[PDB]
Design an enzyme around this catalytic site. Structure first.
Site, PDB file in Angstrom:
ATOM      1  N   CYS A   1      -2.625   5.040   3.478  1.00 58.50           N
ATOM      2  CA  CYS A   1      -3.350   3.897   3.306  1.00 58.50           C
ATOM      3  C   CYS A   1      -4.220   3.962   4.869  1.00 58.50           C
ATOM      4  O   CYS A   1      -3.453   3.920   5.923  1.00 58.50           O
ATOM      5  CB  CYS A   1      -2.962   2.732   2.912  1.00 58.50           C
ATOM      6  SG  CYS A   1      -4.021   1.439   2.361  1.00 58.50           S
TER       7      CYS A   1
ATOM      8  N   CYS B   1       0.719  -1.260   0.121  1.00 61.38           N
ATOM      9  CA  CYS B   1      -0.079  -0.055  -0.047  1.00 61.38           C
ATOM     10  C   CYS B   1       0.935   1.278  -0.020  1.00 61.38           C
ATOM     11  O   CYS B   1       1.908   1.308   0.652  1.00 61.38           O
ATOM     12  CB  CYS B   1      -1.085  -0.070   1.346  1.00 61.38           C
ATOM     13  SG  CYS B   1      -2.289  -1.016   1.031  1.00 61.38           S
TER      14      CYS B   1
ATOM     15  N   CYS C   1      -1.190  -0.853  -3.980  1.00 63.28           N
ATOM     16  CA  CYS C   1      -2.605  -0.638  -3.634  1.00 63.28           C
ATOM     17  C   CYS C   1      -2.799   0.754  -3.625  1.00 63.28           C
ATOM     18  O   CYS C   1      -2.396   1.494  -2.730  1.00 63.28           O
ATOM     19  CB  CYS C   1      -2.837  -1.316  -2.138  1.00 63.28           C
ATOM     20  SG  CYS C   1      -4.317  -0.753  -1.513  1.00 63.28           S
TER      21      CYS C   1
ATOM     22  N   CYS D   1      -5.270   5.181  -1.394  1.00 63.25           N
ATOM     23  CA  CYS D   1      -4.617   5.497  -0.169  1.00 63.25           C
ATOM     24  C   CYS D   1      -3.767   6.862  -0.481  1.00 63.25           C
ATOM     25  O   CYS D   1      -2.893   6.897   0.292  1.00 63.25           O
ATOM     26  CB  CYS D   1      -3.616   4.288   0.507  1.00 63.25           C
ATOM     27  SG  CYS D   1      -3.059   3.226  -0.602  1.00 63.25           S
TER      28      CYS D   1
HETATM   29 ZN   LIG Z   1      -3.873   0.876  -0.010  1.00 64.05          ZN
END
Ligand SMILES: [Zn+2]
Length: 146
Positions: free
Chosen positions: A42, A38, A69, A72
């Site tokens: 996040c 992330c 990811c 975030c």
């Molecule tokens: Zn994330």
């Protein structure tokens, strides 16, 4: 120079638990379970205090063999995001004496008069018209009037 992680695991975990959206450069959380890393910030519940990795930059974790990811706040996204901060800016922006357009303020915020009027009432409590009348009423009442 060079966005690196904190000085310790506890210090870094703080920004993670804090969920600071302005952690652009904090540390990317690598998930061994899903195999994803992330962005610096996040706040998605993933990987416990053992099954999670810490990377200074997304490029570092990615190279190790992990999937990024988003959602975030990776870099450049939210301009401000704040109801109190918004109305606060409006109160100052509306520091004039002549009647100003209502929708105009709505133009800068990109919302309807219901949001501005509602937010301004939730924080300020009184409409812009009351402020102007407040001074006039205070100057009159101050003279033992009424
Ligand atoms: Zn994330």
């Amino acid at each position: 120079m060079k966005k690196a992680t904190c000085l310790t695991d506890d210090q870094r975990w703080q920004s993670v638990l804090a969920r600071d959206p302005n952690a652009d450069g904090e540390f990317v959380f690598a998930v061994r379970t899903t195999g994803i890393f992330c962005r610096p910030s996040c706040r998605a519940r993933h990987a416990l205090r053992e099954n999670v990795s810490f990377y200074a930059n997304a490029s570092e974790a990615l190279a190790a063999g992990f999937r990024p990811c988003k959602r975030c706040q990776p870099e450049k996204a939210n301009a401000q995001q704040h109801r109190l901060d918004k109305i606060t800016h409006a109160c100052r922006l509306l520091e004039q004496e002549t009647p100003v357009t209502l929708e105009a303020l709505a133009d800068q915020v990109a919302m309807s008069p219901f949001h501005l009027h509602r937010l301004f009432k939730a924080t300020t409590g009184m409409t812009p018209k009351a402020w102007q009348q407040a001074w006039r009423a205070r100057r009159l009442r101050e003279s033992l009037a009424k």
